[PDB]
C-alpha cells in the first residue's frame, strides 16, 4: 500500500474547482449522497490493489500503454 508523506514536498497541484449541482445528478439525494460519501471515504488515505483494479478497468490497454510510455519519459528526464 502507498500512503502520503509527512511534510509533503509538493503543494503546487492547483486542482480544478469542484463543480456543484442538484442532488439528482450525484448519487441521487441528500441522504444517498451522504451515505455514499461515507462509504467511499474509507479509500481516501491510501493507494492499493483496489485502486489499481479500477485504474486498469477504466484505462484499458490504450491508457495503460500511454501511461507507461509517459512514465518512461519522466524517468528518462529525471
Amino acid at each position: 500500500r502507498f500512503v502520503r508523506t509527512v511534510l509533503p514536498f509538493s503543494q503546487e497541484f492547483q486542482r480544478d474547482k469542484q463543480p456543484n449541482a442538484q442532488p439528482q445528478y450525484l448519487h441521487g439525494s441528500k441522504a444517498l449522497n451522504l451515505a455514499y460519501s461515507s462509504i467511499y471515504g474509507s479509500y481516501r488515505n491510501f493507494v492499493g490493489p483496489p485502486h489499481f483494479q479500477v485504474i486498469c478497468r477504466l484505462l484499458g490497454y490504450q491508457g495503460i500503454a500511454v501511461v507507461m510510455e509517459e512514465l518512461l519519459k519522466v524517468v528518462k528526464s529525471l
Binding site: 480544478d16 456543484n20 449541482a21 442538484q22
Partner: peptide
C-alpha cells in the same frame, strides 16, 4: 492547453425551460 481552453471557452431568454432551470439553479 486543454484545461486552459475549457476555462476560457466557457458557456455563453424567451424559453420557459431556460427560465425554470435558472430559477431552480438559483434555488440551490
Amino acid at each position: 492547453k486543454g484545461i486552459q481552453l475549457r476555462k476560457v471557452e466557457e458557456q455563453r431568454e424567451n424559453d420557459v425551460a431556460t427560465i425554470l432551470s435558472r430559477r431552480i439553479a438559483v434555488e440551490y
